[model samples]
Structures are given as C-alpha cells and as structure tokens.
Target: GSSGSSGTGEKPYECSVCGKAFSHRQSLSVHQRIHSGKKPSGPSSG
Candidate 1:
C-alpha cells in the first residue's frame, strides 16, 4: 500500500547515537543494537 518507507519522505524515528532516522520505530530499535554490541536472536541465543 506504499505506506512503508516508499517515497513517504517521513522518518519519525531517529537514532540517538548516529542520528540516523528511520520510518519505523522497530527499525531504529534494531539499529541501536549495533552500537550496543547486542547480537540478534538466532545462533547466538541459548
């Protein structure tokens, strides 16, 4: 439906450390993990 980051020119969520804006909050949350050295769920999970 073109509602997900498709030429919307809107990035409400922003990264506090890198100042990178994202269309979705979840995307920003995922990016934050990079700075925190947190591994995503998968092989690293116990």
Candidate 2:
C-alpha cells in the first residue's frame, strides 16, 4: 500500500531531548532506558 510522498505520516514519535526522532513509541522508550543507565543487556547468544 504505497502512500503519499517519501516519508508522509511516517515520523510519529519525536525525542524532546536532542530533537531526535523515532518511528514508534516503543523505540523511544528503549532509547530512554539507555540514558538512565538501566542497560540490562545479556551476552550475545550464538
């Protein structure tokens, strides 16, 4: 379903800190965690 323009109605969420933006809210939430230093990352599993 090709829509209008190249990025029309695509950018939904926008970061207020650095004026950076995201496509989805979930992505923004994950980014916020990084700033808070709550990186609960796990070792890479092969």
Candidate 3:
C-alpha cells in the first residue's frame, strides 16, 4: 500500500531509538525533545 511505501511516502526523518518515522526534520526535532529531557513547558525569558 502507498501508506508504507517509501517511493511516494518515504519519511525523511527517522528515530534512532525506536526506528519510528516522520515526514520532516522539524517533526523529528520536536519528537527528539521528548527524549532529551525537555517537555515544552513554556517560553522562558531570563
């Protein structure tokens, strides 16, 4: 199925820990934060 095929739906970003996939680097970057000990609490100004 086209859902999992890499030809047209290949995910450019991949998670090294679990091999999960993402379409863009931005999505992967945000997901990586979960493992980096950051939870997007809120903006900080100090």
Candidate 4:
C-alpha cells in the first residue's frame, strides 16, 4: 500500500475501503484486519 501521497507530508498508508489513515504500513495492515473480520488474538483479547 504505497500511496503516492506517502513521504510527501501525508499518511503513508490509507484504507481504501474505509477512510482511515496511518503513518506506518504495519499499522495500516493491522487495522485492515477489522474489515476482513479477523480479530488479532493477543493479551488484549483477554
């Protein structure tokens, strides 16, 4: 998800299906999980 706006004073990644913006690629991907319905199981899951 290399949007052209990235590195140009804009959020590096954006959720196309939604309207969320993130500074890091990993953050964007993790957030995308929300759309895919795949919740991440971590200590927070408890």
- What are the per-model numbers of colliding residue pairs? 0, 0, 0, 0
Tens digits of per-residue lDDT, candidate 2, 1-46, equal 9766785554778777555678889998888765685444866655
Q: List the residue pairs that clash in candidate 4.
A: none
Displacement of the residue 10 alpha carbon in candidate 2, Å: 7.0
lDDT of 3 by residue, 1-46 (tens): 4576557655768898656789889999888877875545778855
For model 4, the local distance difference test gives 0.77
RMSD in Å for model 3: 8.5
Query: Candidate 1 clashing pairs?
Result: none
lDDT of 4 by residue, 1-46 (tens): 7666545546768888778888889999989888885445764754
**In candidate 1, what residue range of length 10 has the lowest lDDT sum?**
1-10
lDDT at position 7, candidate 3: 72
TM-score of each: 0.52, 0.45, 0.49, 0.53
Q: Any runs in candidate 3 off by more than 4 Å, and if so which? A: 1-10, 38-46
Worst 10 contiguous positions by lDDT, candidate 3? 1-10
Per-residue lDDT tens digits for candidate 1, residues 1-46, read 4565655555778787767888889998988888875445687566
Q: How close is candidate 4 to the true structure, as a TM-score?
A: 0.53
Better of 1 and 2 by lDDT: 1
Q: How accurate is candidate 1 locally (lDDT)?
A: 0.76
Number of the top candidate by TM-score?
4
| Per-residue error (Å), model 4, residue 18 | 0.9
